[PDB]
Amino acid sequence: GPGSMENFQKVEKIGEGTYGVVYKARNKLTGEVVALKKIRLDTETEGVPSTAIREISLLKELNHPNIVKLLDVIHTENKLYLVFEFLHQDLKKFMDASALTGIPLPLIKSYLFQLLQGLAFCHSHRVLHRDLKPQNLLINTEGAIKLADFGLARAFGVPVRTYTHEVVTLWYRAPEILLGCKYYSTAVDIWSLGCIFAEMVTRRALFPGDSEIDQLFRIFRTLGTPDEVVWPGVTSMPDYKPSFPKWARQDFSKVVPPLDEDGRSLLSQMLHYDPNKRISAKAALAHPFFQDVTKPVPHLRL
Amino acid sequence: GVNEVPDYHEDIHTYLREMEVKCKPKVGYMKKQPDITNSMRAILVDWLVEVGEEYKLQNETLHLAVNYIDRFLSSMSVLRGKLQLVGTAAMLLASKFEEIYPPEVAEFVYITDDTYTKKQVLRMEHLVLKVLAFDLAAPTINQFLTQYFLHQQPANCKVESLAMFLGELSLIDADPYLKYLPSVIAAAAFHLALYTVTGQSWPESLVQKTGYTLETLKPCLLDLHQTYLRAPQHAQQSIREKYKNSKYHGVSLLNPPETLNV
Ligand SMILES: COc1cc(Br)ccc1O
Ligand SMILES: COc1cc(Br)ccc1O
Ligand SMILES: COc1cc(Br)ccc1O
Ligand SMILES: COc1cc(Br)ccc1O
Ligand SMILES: COc1cc(Br)ccc1O
Ligand SMILES: COc1cc(Br)ccc1O
């Protein structure tokens, strides 16, 4: 822990969360710009938050170009400072900043590709992210996108056992979570990336539900109400209801009209109902969609 | 089989094997422990088994907590009157990591019989974190066992529960078990369990996965076989009691085999 709050000069606040507030700071000796996430152990009513215990322990071993790097942990008795590498913006603000311009297909492609590398790396190191959404993906000026906020992440075993329910921000939540399945796996992260893919194209959320059931219904109206054929077991699932409306699956070219043959192929496989058939981050790296992928810088500035 | 992460199971295995060497305690730490013994450790761990039953915690949590204690005690010298405070903070941290619903801190103070205060437990929580440098995602015997379990033809609950049980018995006795890695005890335990229940042996397929053979497992197997035979007589009994429960198929009631023909 070779770090001291005395070599940092606060610059501005760049975010906030349950944990607390994030500031951009500058290392006065090396010049390095960092994000400082402050956890107020001050509220030690129960000690060090489990969310922070998971975030720190899991990020300490997740070293990958597309996962935000934990640089240091400064550990007063009063406070706890997580020093993260500094990235300029998050994907949601960029999508807003890209309002009526669109995000260029090369950049969507590049971003999806990098997101898949980082998630594959998580999965290969027994870590589920469980809150992939645009607000939690950080971009730099150099064309990098990195998974961040591991506050809800979780070290899984093989095979998985039952973990916390109603995880993932609702808009990005996989159907097997919405249907209260006993077990969920790496597939839930893939689902999230699928939503984000579609969202990078349209700049609008794909399934913006206002409730668990409205969420399911939004999903079902787009991909079709699942049955024993498309998804064996579904009808047995704890929160499956036989009275669910049976919506026909609409043609996939209509879900995301600007998307090409390869794009649609990939999207459909990210959004397969059955977690067992849904594509892995690792297999998805090889999809033809990426044949011509490059890494361009973001077209706009911070 | 997404619950069994087909695309990542080997990556994960390979990764855990690396990590278990980094998260390993010093085999000979109790000698450099002036004021505590293997016997006191056995008492502490046996207690932690009861706490886990009391609060209906995962078995993974118990394994994590033991891992934390043995690494702390590998670098931090502890008086006998403080051994429990280490153990309680270990269990708290392990719960915050592994449990959906950790017991509240107050509950941890309670199970220590107000030996310690809520301040002491919290202050120790920080100390353990500083000593471990937050490195809490440690491979446990269980995380190995569950993978080995996929190699049964077919799955057998008695085999699984008994493997768990044997592996848990190993946590109690720093001597000899500190000298063996989680992946090796799990392999010993799996074969012992399999043999005992079905007469079967370490499968070829697990030789492929792990590189371990009954040849390389032999030392640990000989130890585990003894621990199994002498378990009714061991001063600590909480694991046997626990593994009477139907939850674990009453495996502690099964009779160990007299020889291993190994
Ligand atoms: C020991 O120094 C540390 C460094 C990092 Br990165 C995380 C936690 C620590 O405790
Ligand atoms: C001026 O250095 C500091 C910066 C922050 Br942010 C917090 C504490 C400090 O001492
Ligand atoms: C832009 O906001 C953030 C940037 C980094 Br780097 C870490 C956390 C944040 O909230
Ligand atoms: C589980 O809740 C619901 C189920 C159906 Br069907 C319709 C409306 C609801 O609110
Ligand atoms: C005195 O403190 C003790 C702690 C444990 Br754990 C076992 C035996 C003891 O005597
Ligand atoms: C002194 O008594 C005890 C000490 C420890 Br450590 C654990 C359980 C006990 O009963």
XYZ file of C-alpha atoms and ligand atoms in Angstrom:
624
model
C 0.000 0.000 0.000
C 2.746 2.500 -1.036
C 0.451 5.532 -1.000
C -0.449 8.531 1.182
C -3.277 11.079 0.893
C -0.513 13.736 1.240
C 0.777 13.179 -2.343
C -2.650 13.787 -3.850
C -4.148 17.139 -4.827
C -7.953 16.979 -5.267
C -9.116 18.482 -8.572
C -12.905 17.998 -8.737
C -15.701 15.513 -7.872
C -16.281 13.099 -10.799
C -18.990 10.866 -9.294
C -20.768 9.512 -6.200
C -22.308 6.273 -4.804
C -23.432 4.460 -1.637
C -19.737 3.960 -0.892
C -19.459 7.726 -1.073
C -17.987 10.289 -3.438
C -15.370 9.920 -6.180
C -12.874 12.715 -6.882
C -10.348 13.167 -9.656
C -6.962 13.792 -8.057
C -3.405 14.385 -9.250
C -0.310 12.667 -7.803
C 2.029 15.533 -7.027
C 5.188 13.442 -7.392
C 4.523 11.348 -10.483
C 1.889 13.545 -12.161
C -0.488 10.582 -12.472
C -4.187 11.422 -12.549
C -6.312 9.089 -10.412
C -9.871 8.656 -9.238
C -10.180 8.476 -5.427
C -13.286 6.575 -4.247
C -13.810 7.329 -0.542
C -15.546 4.731 1.654
C -16.719 6.330 4.925
C -15.806 3.523 7.347
C -16.833 6.453 9.587
C -20.191 4.659 9.538
C -18.437 1.695 11.203
C -21.790 0.632 12.710
C -21.049 -2.719 10.995
C -17.383 -2.178 10.073
C -16.017 -2.415 6.577
C -18.849 -2.726 4.015
C -19.090 -6.109 2.327
C -19.465 -4.311 -1.013
C -16.048 -2.673 -0.446
C -14.532 -5.987 0.721
C -15.649 -7.622 -2.515
C -14.661 -4.700 -4.716
C -11.157 -4.457 -3.304
C -10.361 -8.205 -3.030
C -11.673 -8.929 -6.527
C -10.120 -5.931 -8.290
C -6.710 -6.695 -6.734
C -6.412 -9.791 -8.949
C -8.418 -8.606 -11.993
C -5.533 -7.024 -13.995
C -6.724 -6.500 -17.566
C -6.680 -3.530 -19.994
C -10.517 -3.508 -20.070
C -11.082 -3.628 -16.313
C -10.511 -0.380 -14.363
C -7.250 -0.714 -12.436
C -7.203 -0.434 -8.642
C -3.863 1.232 -8.025
C -3.804 1.388 -4.233
C -5.872 1.288 -1.043
C -5.162 3.890 1.638
C -6.404 2.544 4.909
C -6.881 5.027 7.744
C -8.826 3.921 10.851
C -11.453 6.581 10.009
C -11.572 6.390 6.192
C -10.731 4.128 3.277
C -9.572 5.554 -0.096
C -9.620 3.415 -3.243
C -7.162 4.841 -5.812
C -8.328 3.894 -9.307
C -6.822 4.754 -12.683
C -8.524 7.857 -14.141
C -10.877 7.610 -17.083
C -12.435 10.739 -18.582
C -16.114 9.771 -18.917
C -18.661 6.868 -18.755
C -20.476 5.343 -21.739
C -23.895 6.775 -20.805
C -22.732 10.436 -20.890
C -20.925 9.764 -24.205
C -24.142 8.286 -25.653
C -25.965 11.477 -24.532
C -23.093 13.638 -25.918
C -23.509 11.644 -29.198
C -27.188 12.594 -29.335
C -28.108 13.161 -33.010
C -24.613 12.395 -34.365
C -24.869 8.667 -33.537
C -21.899 6.564 -32.325
C -19.926 5.452 -35.468
C -20.174 1.713 -36.148
C -16.316 1.370 -35.811
C -16.582 2.691 -32.261
C -19.546 0.545 -31.247
C -17.664 -2.474 -32.653
C -14.415 -1.562 -30.857
C -16.287 -0.906 -27.615
C -18.258 -4.155 -27.724
C -15.068 -6.060 -28.517
C -13.256 -4.553 -25.533
C -16.215 -5.128 -23.211
C -16.185 -8.784 -24.243
C -12.460 -9.125 -23.540
C -12.864 -7.665 -20.037
C -15.919 -9.731 -19.190
C -14.281 -12.870 -20.560
C -11.362 -12.124 -18.250
C -13.706 -11.704 -15.280
C -15.415 -14.996 -16.106
C -12.070 -16.814 -16.481
C -11.174 -15.608 -12.930
C -14.445 -16.774 -11.216
C -15.953 -13.227 -11.025
C -19.537 -12.204 -11.957
C -19.972 -8.461 -12.488
C -23.752 -8.378 -11.960
C -24.329 -4.684 -12.798
C -23.101 -4.118 -16.328
C -24.754 -0.948 -17.605
C -23.509 2.145 -19.537
C -23.028 4.250 -16.390
C -20.488 1.635 -15.159
C -18.352 1.457 -18.328
C -15.537 4.011 -18.421
C -13.956 5.389 -21.600
C -10.641 7.222 -22.095
C -9.499 9.645 -24.781
C -7.445 6.837 -26.338
C -10.359 4.615 -27.382
C -10.367 2.273 -24.414
C -13.519 1.152 -22.627
C -13.200 -0.581 -19.211
C -15.641 -2.360 -16.863
C -15.936 -0.536 -13.546
C -17.918 -0.498 -10.289
C -17.319 -4.024 -8.911
C -19.388 -3.199 -5.844
C -22.002 -5.788 -6.772
C -19.509 -8.319 -8.157
C -19.093 -11.775 -6.624
C -16.554 -14.604 -6.653
C -18.403 -17.679 -7.917
C -17.607 -21.398 -7.565
C -18.098 -24.225 -10.123
C -20.841 -25.193 -10.421
C -22.490 -22.023 -9.057
C -24.629 -22.038 -5.913
C -27.530 -19.687 -5.085
C -26.432 -16.011 -4.844
C -28.203 -12.703 -4.131
C -31.413 -12.215 -6.105
C -32.806 -9.256 -8.059
C -29.222 -8.314 -8.953
C -28.284 -6.093 -11.939
C -29.903 -2.726 -12.656
C -33.426 -3.663 -13.871
C -33.094 -2.436 -17.460
C -30.130 -4.853 -17.943
C -31.432 -7.764 -15.848
C -31.519 -11.243 -17.421
C -34.860 -13.083 -17.609
C -33.656 -15.964 -15.429
C -33.175 -13.406 -12.638
C -36.616 -11.919 -13.288
C -38.126 -15.425 -13.103
C -36.511 -16.086 -9.709
C -34.375 -19.015 -10.894
C -32.468 -20.755 -8.088
C -29.211 -20.453 -9.976
C -27.711 -17.937 -12.361
C -24.296 -17.811 -13.972
C -21.979 -15.940 -16.330
C -24.881 -15.701 -18.815
C -26.409 -12.793 -16.848
C -23.373 -10.629 -17.705
C -23.716 -11.535 -21.386
C -27.361 -10.506 -21.237
C -26.350 -7.082 -19.864
C -23.740 -6.607 -22.619
C -26.444 -7.483 -25.161
C -28.683 -4.711 -23.875
C -25.715 -2.305 -23.975
C -24.855 -3.355 -27.549
C -28.377 -2.556 -28.714
C -28.229 0.669 -26.694
C -24.951 1.820 -28.257
C -26.691 1.527 -31.652
C -30.011 3.263 -30.860
C -28.801 5.431 -27.939
C -31.982 4.268 -26.118
C -32.398 1.430 -23.581
C -33.774 -1.764 -25.191
C -35.954 -2.945 -22.271
C -36.716 0.152 -20.105
C -39.096 -1.485 -17.618
C -40.643 0.243 -14.580
C -41.208 -3.024 -12.662
C -39.967 -6.607 -12.653
C -43.121 -7.737 -14.461
C -43.227 -4.780 -16.891
C -39.568 -5.622 -17.565
C -40.364 -9.282 -18.370
C -43.265 -8.139 -20.535
C -41.065 -5.699 -22.457
C -38.581 -8.517 -23.073
C -41.328 -11.002 -24.037
C -42.952 -8.520 -26.484
C -39.612 -8.161 -28.322
C -37.973 -11.601 -28.234
C -41.237 -13.488 -27.817
C -42.885 -15.110 -24.793
C -40.563 -18.109 -24.049
C -41.934 -21.724 -23.986
C -40.614 -25.225 -23.243
C -39.357 -25.390 -26.842
C -37.205 -22.260 -26.866
C -36.269 -22.573 -23.204
C -36.728 -25.939 -21.412
C -37.663 -25.483 -17.718
C -38.990 -21.935 -18.113
C -42.581 -22.984 -17.311
C -41.378 -24.582 -14.060
C -39.476 -21.513 -12.918
C -40.552 -20.100 -9.496
C -41.938 -16.853 -10.938
C -43.187 -18.158 -14.220
C -46.955 -17.753 -14.434
C -49.034 -19.786 -16.978
C -51.258 -16.728 -17.312
C -48.339 -14.769 -18.878
C -49.469 -13.289 -22.235
C -48.041 -15.276 -25.164
C -46.443 -12.739 -27.523
C -45.030 -13.837 -30.866
C -41.329 -13.295 -31.404
C -40.922 -10.361 -33.767
C -38.392 -10.646 -36.627
C -34.990 -9.596 -35.253
C -34.298 -7.052 -38.017
C -37.003 -4.979 -36.365
C -35.519 -5.043 -32.874
C -32.542 -2.989 -34.067
C -33.200 -1.834 -37.680
C -29.787 -0.213 -38.508
C -27.921 -3.388 -37.441
C -26.363 -5.541 -40.264
C -26.488 -9.373 -40.677
C -23.414 -10.007 -38.457
C -24.512 -7.518 -35.775
C -27.992 -9.113 -35.597
C -26.435 -12.537 -35.482
C -24.318 -11.545 -32.500
C -27.146 -9.677 -30.706
C -29.553 -12.610 -31.018
C -26.960 -14.879 -29.420
C -26.393 -12.480 -26.530
C -30.164 -12.359 -25.920
C -30.976 -16.059 -26.181
C -33.599 -16.904 -23.559
C -31.965 -20.130 -22.446
C -28.796 -19.285 -20.386
C -27.324 -22.580 -21.663
C -27.557 -21.483 -25.337
C -26.660 -17.830 -24.770
C -23.220 -17.026 -26.196
C -20.173 -16.756 -23.867
C -17.933 -13.649 -23.796
C -15.076 -15.904 -25.027
C -16.934 -17.409 -28.026
C -18.344 -14.008 -28.928
C -14.811 -12.647 -29.462
C -14.614 -14.870 -32.585
C -17.905 -13.736 -34.117
C -17.703 -12.440 -37.737
C -19.116 -9.088 -36.559
C -15.582 -8.228 -35.408
C -13.733 -9.261 -38.620
C -12.659 -5.668 -39.320
C -12.532 -4.222 -35.808
C -10.023 -1.474 -34.970
C -9.549 0.739 -31.906
C -10.407 4.397 -32.848
C -10.304 7.211 -30.244
C -13.755 8.614 -29.203
C -14.814 11.151 -31.877
C -15.834 13.727 -29.224
C -13.940 15.186 -26.217
C -14.434 15.197 -22.453
C -24.460 -26.631 -18.108
C -24.018 -22.820 -17.873
C -24.191 -23.219 -14.077
C -21.059 -25.364 -14.592
C -19.440 -22.683 -16.798
C -18.243 -25.037 -19.616
C -16.439 -22.145 -21.431
C -14.415 -21.183 -18.335
C -14.159 -24.222 -16.003
C -10.562 -25.038 -16.945
C -9.448 -21.391 -16.908
C -10.985 -21.198 -13.443
C -9.326 -24.425 -12.291
C -5.893 -23.347 -13.588
C -6.430 -19.951 -11.933
C -7.385 -21.445 -8.526
C -4.320 -23.730 -8.626
C -2.080 -20.678 -8.987
C -3.945 -18.765 -6.291
C -3.883 -21.580 -3.722
C -0.044 -21.417 -3.742
C -0.153 -17.626 -3.132
C -2.814 -17.941 -0.391
C -0.881 -20.709 1.365
C 0.013 -20.377 5.080
C 3.423 -21.246 6.563
C 3.337 -25.005 7.310
C 5.435 -24.347 10.429
C 3.870 -21.271 12.050
C 2.715 -22.750 15.380
C 6.316 -23.458 16.455
C 7.028 -19.723 15.956
C 3.746 -19.140 17.849
C 5.097 -18.804 21.431
C 1.749 -19.018 23.245
C -0.590 -21.094 21.073
C -0.595 -24.675 19.797
C -2.157 -26.955 17.219
C -4.484 -28.032 20.023
C -5.744 -24.470 20.630
C -6.242 -24.033 16.878
C -8.333 -27.257 16.779
C -10.508 -25.862 19.551
C -10.942 -22.574 17.668
C -11.836 -24.204 14.372
C -14.183 -26.676 16.039
C -15.906 -23.649 17.576
C -16.164 -21.972 14.170
C -17.886 -25.120 12.894
C -20.508 -24.678 15.615
C -20.906 -21.002 14.816
C -21.494 -21.918 11.142
C -24.200 -24.409 12.206
C -25.679 -21.893 14.666
C -26.042 -19.169 11.978
C -26.614 -21.639 9.142
C -23.633 -20.273 7.186
C -22.196 -21.783 4.035
C -19.424 -24.361 4.298
C -17.393 -22.129 1.985
C -17.506 -19.402 4.640
C -16.035 -21.778 7.223
C -13.223 -22.729 4.825
C -12.529 -19.059 4.016
C -12.346 -18.094 7.672
C -9.879 -20.902 8.468
C -7.730 -19.782 5.511
C -7.743 -16.205 6.845
C -6.761 -17.334 10.397
C -3.850 -19.532 9.259
C -2.400 -16.760 7.015
C -2.791 -14.154 9.827
C -1.152 -16.507 12.288
C 1.650 -17.054 9.748
C 2.848 -13.462 10.296
C 1.133 -12.221 13.478
C 2.066 -13.511 16.882
C -1.079 -13.967 19.052
C -1.690 -14.555 22.799
C -4.055 -17.385 23.748
C -6.578 -14.897 25.204
C -6.787 -13.228 21.774
C -6.956 -16.328 19.539
C -10.767 -16.101 19.531
C -10.772 -12.449 18.554
C -8.756 -13.327 15.440
C -11.119 -16.236 14.696
C -14.257 -14.058 15.141
C -12.958 -11.317 12.836
C -11.961 -14.019 10.306
C -15.521 -15.413 10.417
C -17.054 -11.899 10.100
C -14.891 -11.029 7.070
C -15.549 -14.472 5.506
C -19.296 -13.923 6.006
C -19.278 -10.422 4.486
C -17.518 -11.984 1.480
C -19.376 -15.218 0.916
C -22.850 -14.839 2.517
C -25.978 -13.296 0.965
C -27.038 -12.407 4.494
C -24.026 -12.036 6.873
C -24.800 -12.131 10.614
C -24.640 -8.623 12.066
C -21.521 -7.587 13.978
C -23.530 -7.638 17.220
C -24.220 -11.327 16.581
C -20.497 -11.977 16.314
C -19.894 -10.211 19.644
C -22.677 -12.350 21.156
C -21.156 -15.752 20.202
C -17.926 -14.773 21.999
C -19.804 -14.534 25.338
C -18.933 -10.838 25.690
C -15.278 -11.835 26.001
C -14.754 -9.021 23.498
C -16.439 -5.735 22.635
C -17.902 -4.628 19.298
C -14.933 -2.214 19.121
C -12.423 -5.034 19.519
C -14.116 -7.137 16.795
C -14.154 -4.163 14.405
C -10.565 -3.139 15.237
C -9.468 -6.742 14.541
C -11.479 -6.777 11.294
C -9.283 -3.904 10.104
C -6.105 -5.579 11.353
C -6.897 -8.847 9.528
C -7.635 -6.856 6.343
C -4.340 -4.957 6.641
C -2.426 -8.190 7.331
C -4.075 -10.086 4.454
C -3.817 -6.924 2.250
C -7.466 -7.525 1.349
C -6.544 -10.753 -0.406
C -9.765 -12.559 0.626
C -10.757 -14.433 -2.573
C -8.791 -17.552 -1.579
C -9.326 -21.015 -3.141
C -10.825 -23.434 -0.561
C -11.062 -27.247 -0.474
C -14.742 -26.852 -1.393
C -14.123 -24.927 -4.590
C -12.004 -27.901 -5.717
C -14.477 -30.535 -4.492
C -17.427 -29.096 -6.386
C -15.420 -29.333 -9.662
C -14.248 -32.887 -8.940
C -17.909 -33.692 -8.250
C -18.758 -33.111 -11.925
C -16.634 -36.181 -12.736
C -18.891 -38.684 -10.936
C -20.605 -41.251 -13.188
C -23.289 -40.727 -11.937
C -23.494 -38.117 -9.163
C -23.936 -39.622 -5.696
C -24.983 -37.418 -2.758
C -23.334 -39.751 -0.203
C -20.017 -39.414 -2.026
C -20.376 -35.619 -2.182
C -21.415 -35.120 1.478
C -18.691 -37.464 2.741
C -16.027 -35.711 0.656
C -17.194 -32.412 2.189
C -17.069 -34.036 5.646
C -13.538 -35.416 5.259
C -12.291 -32.109 3.854
C -13.827 -30.323 6.833
C -12.084 -32.697 9.244
C -8.769 -31.526 7.786
C -9.364 -27.897 8.883
C -9.124 -28.998 12.542
C -5.577 -30.408 12.476
C -2.867 -27.926 11.371
C -0.597 -30.988 11.694
C -0.471 -32.545 9.203
C -2.886 -30.714 6.907
C -0.974 -27.367 6.707
C 1.535 -29.147 4.521
C -1.095 -29.935 1.807
C -2.801 -27.558 -0.652
C -6.625 -27.249 -0.910
C -6.573 -28.964 -4.314
C -4.750 -31.989 -2.875
C -6.865 -32.486 0.253
C -9.982 -32.219 -1.932
C -8.574 -34.889 -4.221
C -7.707 -37.093 -1.240
C -11.136 -36.528 0.258
C -12.894 -37.215 -3.058
C -11.158 -40.562 -3.586
C -11.620 -41.530 0.029
C -15.321 -40.666 -0.190
C -15.784 -42.434 -3.499
C -13.928 -45.569 -2.348
C -15.810 -45.715 0.970
C -19.288 -45.348 -0.605
C -19.036 -47.080 -4.022
C -15.659 -48.855 -3.904
C -14.611 -46.693 -6.895
C -11.351 -44.746 -7.269
C -9.873 -41.407 -8.459
C -11.071 -41.305 -12.102
C -8.816 -41.042 -15.164
C -10.728 -37.881 -16.070
C -9.589 -36.153 -12.858
C -6.046 -37.290 -13.588
C -6.500 -35.392 -16.884
C -7.908 -32.293 -15.204
C -5.541 -32.047 -12.226
C -2.437 -33.999 -13.141
C -2.739 -35.748 -9.744
C -2.625 -39.582 -9.479
C -3.215 -41.926 -6.519
C 0.592 -42.021 -6.585
C 0.922 -38.281 -5.863
C -2.148 -38.232 -3.560
C -0.795 -41.123 -1.424
C 0.828 -39.069 1.472
C -2.296 -36.952 2.063
C -4.564 -39.970 1.500
C -2.689 -41.918 4.237
C -3.168 -39.006 6.638
C -6.820 -38.489 5.731
C -7.487 -42.209 6.075
C -6.162 -42.033 9.667
C -8.086 -38.884 10.468
C -11.223 -40.697 9.265
C -10.577 -43.792 11.427
C -9.677 -41.822 14.550
C -12.468 -39.250 14.200
C -14.845 -40.828 16.782
C -12.004 -40.426 19.330
C -10.796 -36.890 18.404
C -11.304 -34.331 21.214
C -13.194 -32.145 18.730
C -16.507 -33.546 17.548
C -18.524 -30.641 16.116
C -17.964 -31.704 12.482
C -19.124 -35.292 13.174
C -22.225 -33.933 14.947
C -22.882 -31.610 12.001
C -22.485 -34.407 9.461
C -25.057 -36.562 11.266
C -27.693 -34.165 9.940
C -29.873 -35.294 7.046
C -28.777 -32.087 5.217
C -25.482 -33.953 4.659
C -27.050 -37.406 4.289
C -25.866 -38.466 7.762
C -22.497 -39.322 6.268
C -20.586 -39.133 9.573
C -22.443 -42.343 10.438
C -20.846 -44.288 7.516
C -18.008 -46.646 8.491
C -14.506 -45.779 7.174
C -12.862 -48.637 5.159
C -10.244 -50.669 7.086
C -7.651 -50.564 4.243
C -7.277 -48.560 1.021
C -5.626 -51.269 -1.121
C -3.468 -48.336 -2.295
C -1.473 -3.793 0.805
O -1.707 -2.839 -0.230
C -2.831 -2.974 -0.994
C -2.876 -2.640 -2.332
C -4.079 -2.804 -3.014
Br -4.159 -2.475 -4.904
C -5.227 -3.234 -2.363
C -5.206 -3.481 -1.010
C -4.016 -3.343 -0.315
O -4.070 -3.633 1.018
C -4.699 17.109 0.018
O -4.648 15.686 0.044
C -5.823 15.024 0.215
C -6.751 14.792 -0.772
C -7.909 14.108 -0.444
Br -9.196 13.786 -1.803
C -8.151 13.665 0.835
C -7.219 13.901 1.820
C -6.055 14.580 1.520
O -5.127 14.817 2.488
C -16.408 9.494 -14.106
O -16.693 8.907 -12.837
C -15.820 7.977 -12.358
C -14.582 7.742 -12.897
C -13.781 6.771 -12.324
Br -12.076 6.449 -13.089
C -14.183 6.040 -11.222
C -15.424 6.278 -10.679
C -16.245 7.247 -11.229
O -17.462 7.443 -10.639
C -46.310 -11.041 -10.786
O -47.082 -9.864 -11.039
C -47.882 -9.831 -12.152
C -48.121 -10.908 -12.997
C -48.942 -10.713 -14.102
Br -49.288 -12.177 -15.260
C -49.498 -9.477 -14.399
C -49.258 -8.402 -13.559
C -48.455 -8.568 -12.441
O -48.283 -7.474 -11.651
C -7.116 -19.477 26.800
O -7.642 -19.289 25.488
C -7.947 -20.355 24.681
C -8.443 -20.215 23.398
C -8.723 -21.342 22.637
Br -9.362 -21.119 20.851
C -8.527 -22.608 23.135
C -8.034 -22.760 24.416
C -7.740 -21.650 25.194
O -7.263 -21.879 26.448
C -11.755 -20.186 26.380
O -12.788 -20.813 25.618
C -12.773 -20.722 24.255
C -11.799 -20.103 23.488
C -11.947 -20.119 22.101
Br -10.688 -19.276 20.955
C -13.032 -20.701 21.484
C -14.003 -21.312 22.240
C -13.875 -21.321 23.623
O -14.814 -21.916 24.407
